[PDB]
Write a protein that binds this ligand. Structure first.
Ligand SMILES: *[C@@H]1O[C@H](CO)[C@@H](O)[C@H](O)[C@H]1NC(C)=O
Ligand SMILES: *[C@@H]1O[C@H](CO)[C@@H](O)[C@H](O)[C@H]1NC(C)=O
Ligand SMILES: *[C@@H]1O[C@H](CO)[C@@H](O)[C@H](O)[C@H]1NC(C)=O
Lengths: 210, 40, 49
């Protein structure tokens, strides 16, 4: 199985490893596009307290492709993390960050008790239709309980954003089952003496045969 | 102002290498000897 | 018309004239003398009733 070099990935590292996050009332919305989106890092990494997908299976994310992907990024209190899901109600679900009931995407979250919480209280995070962007602040402190810790939550709402395709080694001069880009078949791969133009990917024989 | 397109307006319809062959294909091409609008 | 190196060196516009139609039907840039059937003439409707 052979595909082009897996370069040109989407900047999940600017979303999940971000220095600063927005509040839930007015969250950041970053557009993810024009890339090979590797979701295995986010899924397998033990750095997250939770990883859940609603419209799609979380393990098929690298097989799937979405027209556009959006990262809705914000900080909320631990006990309220459960509201970031379709079909929910509550302070966030109803007044700050509402998801569709037919929502397709993945919700990823982790604690930021050693990042955003401050000894005197980090009150820079404030809270009050789907994705529709008076207020009170969260008293985030490193000494509070788990349900009171700040959590960094990123919702990836789900063509230009496709999962990665891993290639295998190529074995010559033997009968193999091959997959090159968009075509498959069975045959023996040997060095050719053909001269393809720089933009040509496949060769064709007279009677429409690769 | 108009000019004669002659036999130009042909492009490789795909990314397939073919050699020593006459290949028939239908695609959007500039018709031969058609008029093209000439701008200065 | 593709050459040995994969480039297009010539082309026939199959609707340019009756000789081009013959060349495309025969799939050859040159044709031998003779009479060939290449198409079908049909009188078109001019109005709608
Ligand atoms: C963030 O950086 C850490 C470096 O320790 C790496 O382990 C993690 O996979 C990165 N995640 C993203 C989305 O860049
Ligand atoms: C347009 O093409 C026709 C031939 O089909 C030619 O007779 C005519 O003069 C051309 N028009 C102009 C403005 O050159
Ligand atoms: C193919 O390219 C070579 C140069 O690498 C040239 O010498 C040869 O004449 C070309 N063949 C044709 C049919 O144009």
């Amino acid at each position: 199985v052979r595909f082009p070099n897996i370069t040109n990935l989407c900047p999940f590292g600017e979303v999940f490893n971000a220095t600063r996050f927005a509040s839930v009332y007015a969250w950041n919305r970053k557009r993810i596009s024009n890339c090979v989106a590797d979701y295995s890092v986010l899924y397998n990494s033990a750095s997250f307290s939770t990883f859940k997908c609603y419209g799609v299976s979380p393990t098929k994310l690298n097989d799937l492709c979405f027209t556009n992907v959006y990262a809705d990024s914000f900080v909320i209190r631990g006990d309220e993390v459960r509201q970031i899901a379709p079909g929910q109600t509550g302070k966030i679900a109803d007044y700050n960050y509402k998801l569709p009931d037919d929502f397709t995407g993945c919700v990823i979250a982790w604690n930021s008790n050693n990042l955003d919480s401050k000894v005197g209280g980090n009150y820079n995070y404030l809270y009050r239709k789907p994705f529709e962007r008076p207020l009170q602040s969260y008293g985030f402190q490193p000494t509070n309980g788990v349900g009171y810790q700040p959590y960094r939550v990123v919702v990836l709402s789900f063509a230009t954003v496709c999962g990665p395709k891993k290639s295998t080694n190529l074995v010559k001069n033997k009968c193999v089952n091959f997959n090159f880009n968009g075509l498959t078949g069975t045959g023996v791969l040997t060095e050719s003496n053909k001269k393809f133009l720089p933009f040509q990917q496949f060769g064709r024989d007279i009677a429409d045969t690769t | 102002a108009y000019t004669n397109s002659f036999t130009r307006g042909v492009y490789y319809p795909d990314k397939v290498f073919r050699s020593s062959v006459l290949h028939s294909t239908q695609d959007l091409f500039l018709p031969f000897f058609s008029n093209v609008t000439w701008f200065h | 018309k593709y050459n040995e190196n994969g480039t297009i060196t010539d082309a026939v516009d199959c609707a340019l004239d009756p000789l081009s139609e013959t060349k495309c039907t025969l799939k050859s840039f040159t044709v031998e003398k003779g009479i060939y059937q290449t198409s079908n003439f049909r009188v078109q409707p001019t109005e709608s009733i």
